[PDB]
Each structure stands twice: as structure tokens, then as C-alpha cells.
Design a protein around this motif. Structure first.
Motif, PDB file in Angstrom:
ATOM      1  N   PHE A  37      23.457  49.562 -23.753  1.00 18.34           N
ATOM      2  CA  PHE A  37      21.937  48.357 -23.930  1.00 18.34           C
ATOM      3  C   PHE A  37      21.828  48.358 -25.292  1.00 18.34           C
ATOM      4  N   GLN A  38      22.666  48.456 -25.712  1.00 18.00           N
ATOM      5  CA  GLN A  38      22.068  48.337 -28.064  1.00 18.00           C
ATOM      6  C   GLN A  38      21.219  48.949 -28.218  1.00 18.00           C
ATOM      7  N   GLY A  88      18.684  37.696 -21.715  1.00 19.50           N
ATOM      8  CA  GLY A  88      16.907  37.943 -21.588  1.00 19.50           C
ATOM      9  C   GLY A  88      17.321  38.918 -20.730  1.00 19.50           C
ATOM     10  N   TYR A  89      15.966  39.279 -20.475  1.00 19.58           N
ATOM     11  CA  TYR A  89      15.522  40.387 -20.257  1.00 19.58           C
ATOM     12  C   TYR A  89      13.745  40.073 -19.077  1.00 19.58           C
ATOM     13  N   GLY A  92      16.405  54.647 -13.826  1.00 13.95           N
ATOM     14  CA  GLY A  92      14.903  54.722 -13.764  1.00 13.95           C
ATOM     15  C   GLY A  92      14.103  55.158 -14.914  1.00 13.95           C
ATOM     16  N   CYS A  93      14.445  53.948 -16.439  1.00 15.77           N
ATOM     17  CA  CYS A  93      14.005  54.549 -17.977  1.00 15.77           C
ATOM     18  C   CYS A  93      13.155  53.858 -18.086  1.00 15.77           C
ATOM     19  N   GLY A  94      13.016  52.243 -17.463  1.00 14.16           N
ATOM     20  CA  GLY A  94      11.924  51.143 -17.989  1.00 14.16           C
ATOM     21  C   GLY A  94      10.765  52.158 -17.321  1.00 14.16           C
ATOM     22  N   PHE A 101      19.273  49.546 -10.261  1.00 18.85           N
ATOM     23  CA  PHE A 101      18.802  50.643 -10.282  1.00 18.85           C
ATOM     24  C   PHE A 101      17.822  50.183  -9.365  1.00 18.85           C
ATOM     25  N   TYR A 119      23.389  34.493 -17.565  1.00 14.72           N
ATOM     26  CA  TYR A 119      21.241  34.237 -17.986  1.00 14.72           C
ATOM     27  C   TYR A 119      21.977  34.840 -19.735  1.00 14.72           C
ATOM     28  N   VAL A 139      13.444  42.894 -13.896  1.00 11.73           N
ATOM     29  CA  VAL A 139      14.060  44.009 -14.405  1.00 11.73           C
ATOM     30  C   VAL A 139      15.273  44.088 -13.491  1.00 11.73           C
ATOM     31  N   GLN A 140      16.482  45.438 -14.114  1.00  7.05           N
ATOM     32  CA  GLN A 140      17.852  45.507 -13.788  1.00  7.05           C
ATOM     33  C   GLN A 140      18.159  44.814 -12.101  1.00  7.05           C
ATOM     34  N   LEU A 179      27.457  45.075 -20.256  1.00  7.89           N
ATOM     35  CA  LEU A 179      25.981  44.976 -19.084  1.00  7.89           C
ATOM     36  C   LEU A 179      26.719  45.834 -17.688  1.00  7.89           C
ATOM     37  N   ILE A 227      17.580  41.251 -11.687  1.00  8.96           N
ATOM     38  CA  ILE A 227      17.936  40.461 -12.456  1.00  8.96           C
ATOM     39  C   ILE A 227      19.279  40.120 -11.224  1.00  8.96           C
ATOM     40  N   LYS A 229      20.526  52.801 -17.634  1.00 11.53           N
ATOM     41  CA  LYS A 229      19.477  53.494 -17.927  1.00 11.53           C
ATOM     42  C   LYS A 229      18.926  53.715 -16.601  1.00 11.53           C
TER      43      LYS A 229
END
Ligand code: 0RR
Length: 439
Positions: free
Chosen positions: A385-386, A282-283, A354-356, A225, A280, A240-241, A213, A244, A352
Motif C-alpha cells: 500500500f504505497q 480512499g480509506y 494486523g498492522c493498523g 484482515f 472505491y 478499514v481493510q 490491492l 471496506i 499489512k
């Protein structure tokens, strides 16, 4: 120049509030039940009415504690944070929009920051004339959707963990300075202007990471982000990012108190001295607070302050052409204006961007950040992120274009939409096809 009202601004209500705070601070008033706490808050919020759902999520966190800590929470923790509120000397905080090419900076002691987060915890940060609040009241409030209550509950755990650690601050740590910066970066350059400027520029280093991360890279310029309203849904449903990061690094919350106004296209925000207090997993819906352990890496996250660049990507809809010269030059401006900050931090840690929910195409967001970092004369770490396929793709592209000319690169990217390959090639694949074609 807008000023966010601290509790003392309203001296009338401040009378009552102050009364109740020292009342608990001293041990005068003792809380026997969580029900007691609830009336405390209702008083501090100056609220007639009252139903149980108002604090449903706070209650839920409370009840997950062991009997010993529930006791601690009501008898010790609350009183102690009332004391932190009482240490407050300010009655408002300044929200300045810097003039062209200038910076609005706001600095605080690590402990002062805890005073303000305490206010949020006790739901006493509101601007009544604007009917705007900046505390934990919505988070505490019960939602119709269980997942949303979980997210809120989880955020509550993070803020509580943080607060407990702020109470145990050494004299040294409480004096350390945390700094927030609203930075106007001047004239926005347009597409042609960019193409020109990049002729002088070569693509710099990029490192890929599948499983790390952004905050796993201390000593880099770490990207948040961001929403144009810094913090995004941190005070609501957002997890989210950006949110979190606020959850694990709650000192960031104070930025909400000085940066009320949306970031302009030529603005970026920098936060220095930020430490991490929770772990933490998850997401979003799977996000869960995890108490920070004792390992080398954990001790560092907790005790080593980091510097964070908040830049807001465009929020696209599905029909928008992200490859337009207008949209591209906009993202080039934002990222580069951001990345060029803090020149002694020669590696950007990002991913990533702005790609969510913002619907950004990552292939292109990658290219833009690479161009920006390169012009910035900085190295870049990309967290995928995998995403195994994207990782492979970006790696290849990096190997084909590193040290190549950035202006030639940009134009290559900008032709994709028109090019023949547009139909059954992603942007990255298209770049690979043209990078292999050279042999
Ligand atoms: O612009 C944004 O807010 C979202 C950018 N973005 C993520 O941050 C994504 C994450 C994700 O898929 N995940 C799940 C995940 C984890 Cl927890 C660990 C390893 C890989 C993944 Cl995919 C994230 C976890 C933590 C954080 Cl801070 C971000 C993500 S996916 C995506 S698009």
C-alpha cells in the motif's frame, strides 16, 4: 447451537411487517416522500418515538440522487426489495461452532443473500432477547462527528449499488452458490513444535506490490484482515481493510448472520463465490464509493467470484512484546491454519495484516506470514500500500532468504529483540545486516 432470528420468528410483528411489505410490493401503498419511507421503517422496526436523526444518513444519500433516481428509489427500489424480503422462507439462521477439526458450512443462492441484505437495509434483523441487531440502523443514525456520518453515508451507497444489481440478476446468476465456512483447524502447535516442523521447510516465493490491492489478484486466496467478530465495525463506524471489503462485496454481510460468536484461536473463516459490486477510493475518512466502470478489469471484478480467507490478527497494545514465543506461535498458527486452506489456490494474496489499529509491527507480521505460506507450500503476494521504504526492505530480505531454511529463519527473527541490533535497527534491517554479513 444458537439461531439468529429472522423476522418470521416473531409472527406477531411479522403480521404487521408482512402487511406493509406486500403493501409496497404491490403498489398498494405508494411513497410520495422520504418522510413516507421513514414511517415505513418505524413500523418495521416497531418503534414508538421517532426523531429525524434516526435516518439522517440514509436521507443524506437519498438527497444526493438526481430527481429521476429519487423517484425510482421511492416508487421502484424500495417496493422491489420488500418483495425480496417476502421471498424469505427461513425463520432463523444457524450459528454453529464446529467441533474440533470439523467445519460449519452454510450455503446460499446469490439471490437468497440479497433477501437478507434487504432485511438489513430495512432494519428488521434483531434478536430482542439478546438486544442485538444485525442491520443498518446505526449506519442510518446521525453521529456527532461529520466524518463518521460520511463513512456511514458511503457504506450506504455501496449497499444500495449492490442491491440495485441484485434486482437485475439473470436467472443463472441468482442461482449461483455463495458459501460460508467456519473452520476448526484442530491442535494448536507451540513454539518449539513449530521450530521442529520448519526444519523440513524452505521459504517460498513472495511478490511485492506497491500500488495494487488484495482484490486485484483474482484466483488467489484473498485475505480479509478480520476482527475476531467477523465484519468488525462494518455495521458501525469501521471503514478499514475488512469493512471496506464488505462494502464492495456485500454478500459477505451474511457471515454476520451465521458466525455470531468470536473466532477461536484455531478457527478461520472462508467465503467462496463472493463477487465485487462497487469500486472505491480512499480509506477510513477518505473512503468514497465509486460506481464500477466498464473496463476489462471492472467487468471481471463484478462477474468473477473470489474466495476469501478471514483470519484475525492479535490486537496488541503498545507495551506487548510481539516477539514473545507465545505471541509469535499464536500468529503462526492463525495464518498457517488459514493459508493451508483451499490447497488448489496456490497463491496467498495478503498485506499489512494486523498492522493498523491492531498495532502489529509489519516487519514481523511479514516474517510470520512468509513462514506460514512457505510451510503451506504456497506463493505469497504482499501489498504494501504505497509504503516505499517497507517495499524496498522486504524485497531485499526476500532476496537474501528465499529458499533458505524456514526454521533457521524463525530463530533468526526471534533473536532480534535480544540481539545487539535491537536498538537502531528494525527487524527487516537487522535481517538485511545479517544477510549481507555473509560476504
Ligand atoms: O489491518 C488493517 O485493517 C489495516 C492494514 N492496513 C491497510 O489495509 C492499509 C491501507 C492503506 O494504507 N490504504 C491507502 C492506500 C490506498 Cl486506498 C491505495 C494505495 C495505497 C494506500 Cl496506502 C489502504 C487502502 C485500501 C485498503 Cl483495503 C487498505 C489500505 S494501511 C494498513 S496498516
Amino acid at each position: 447451537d444458537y439461531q439468529f432470528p429472522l423476522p418470521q420468528k416473531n409472527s406477531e410483528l411479522w403480521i404487521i411487517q408482512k402487511k406493509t411489505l406486500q403493501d409496497l410490493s404491490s403498489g398498494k401503498q405508494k411513497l410520495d416522500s422520504f418522510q413516507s419511507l421513514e414511517s415505513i421503517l418505524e413500523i418495521l422496526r416497531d418503534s414508538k418515538n421517532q426523531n429525524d436523526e434516526k435516518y439522517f444518513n440514509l436521507k443524506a444519500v437519498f438527497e444526493q440522487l438526481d430527481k429521476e433516481e429519487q423517484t425510482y428509489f421511492l416508487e421502484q427500489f424500495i417496493p422491489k426489495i420488500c418483495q425480496l424480503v417476502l421471498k424469505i422462507k427461513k425463520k432463523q439462521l444457524k450459528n454453529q461452532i464446529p467441533k474440533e477439526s470439523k467445519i460449519y458450512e452454510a450455503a446460499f443462492s446469490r439471490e437468497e443473500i440479497s433477501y437478507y441484505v434487504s432485511c438489513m437495509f430495512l432494519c428488521i434483523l434483531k434478536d430482542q432477547d439478546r438486544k442485538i441487531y444485525k442491520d443498518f440502523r446505526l449506519i442510518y443514525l446521525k453521529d456527532l462527528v461529520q466524518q463518521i456520518n460520511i463513512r456511514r453515508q458511503e457504506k450506504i451507497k455501496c449497499f444500495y449499488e449492490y442491491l440495485k444489481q441484485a434486482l437485475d440478476f439473470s436467472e443463472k446468476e441468482s442461482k449461483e452458490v455463495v458459501i460460508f465456512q467456519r473452520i476448526n483447524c484442530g491442535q494448536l502447535e507451540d513454539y518449539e513444535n513449530w521450530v521442529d516442523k520448519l526444519k523440513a521447510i524452505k521459504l517460498k516465493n513472495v511478490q511485492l506490490t506497491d500500488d495494487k490491492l488484495i482484490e486485484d489478484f483474482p484466483g488467489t486466496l484473498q485475505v480479509d484482515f478480520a476482527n475476531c467478530d467477523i465484519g468488525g465495525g462494518i455495521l458501525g463506524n469501521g471503514l478499514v481493510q475488512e469493512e471496506i471489503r464488505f462494502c464492495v462485496c456485500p454478500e459477505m454481510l451474511v457471515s454476520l448472520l451465521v458466525f455470531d460468536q468470536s473466532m477461536e484461536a484455531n478457527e478461520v473463516i472462508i467465503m467462496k463465490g463472493i463477487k465485487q459490486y462497487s469500486d472505491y477510493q480512499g480509506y477510513s475518512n477518505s473512503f468514497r464509493f465509486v460506481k464500477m466502470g466498464n473496463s476489462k478489469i471492472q467487468k471481471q471484478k463484478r462477474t468473477n467470484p473470489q474466495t476469501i480467507l478471514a483470519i484475525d490478527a492479535l490486537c496488541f497494545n503498545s507495551s506487548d512484546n510481539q516477539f514473545s514465543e507465545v505471541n509469535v506461535s499464536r500468529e503462526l498458527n492463525k495464518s498457517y491454519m488459514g493459508f493451508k486452506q483451499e490447497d488448489q489456490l496456490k497463491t496467498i494474496s495478503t498485506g499489512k495484516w494486523g498492522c493498523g489499529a491492531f498495532l502489529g509491527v509489519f516487519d514481523l507480521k511479514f516474517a510470520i506470514q512468509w513462514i506460514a505460506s512457505s510451510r503451506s507450500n504456497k506463493k505469497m503476494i504482499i501489498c504494501t500500500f504505497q509504503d516505499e521504504q517497507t517495499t524496498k526492505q522486504i524485497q531485499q530480505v526476500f532476496d537474501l532468504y528465499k529458499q533458505k531454511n524456514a526454521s533457521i529463519f524463525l530463530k533468526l527473527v526471534m533473536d532480534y529483540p535480544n540481539s545487539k541490533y535491537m536498538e537502531d535497527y528494525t527487524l527487516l534491517e537487522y535481517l538485511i545486516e545479517l544477510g549481507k554479513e555473509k560476504a
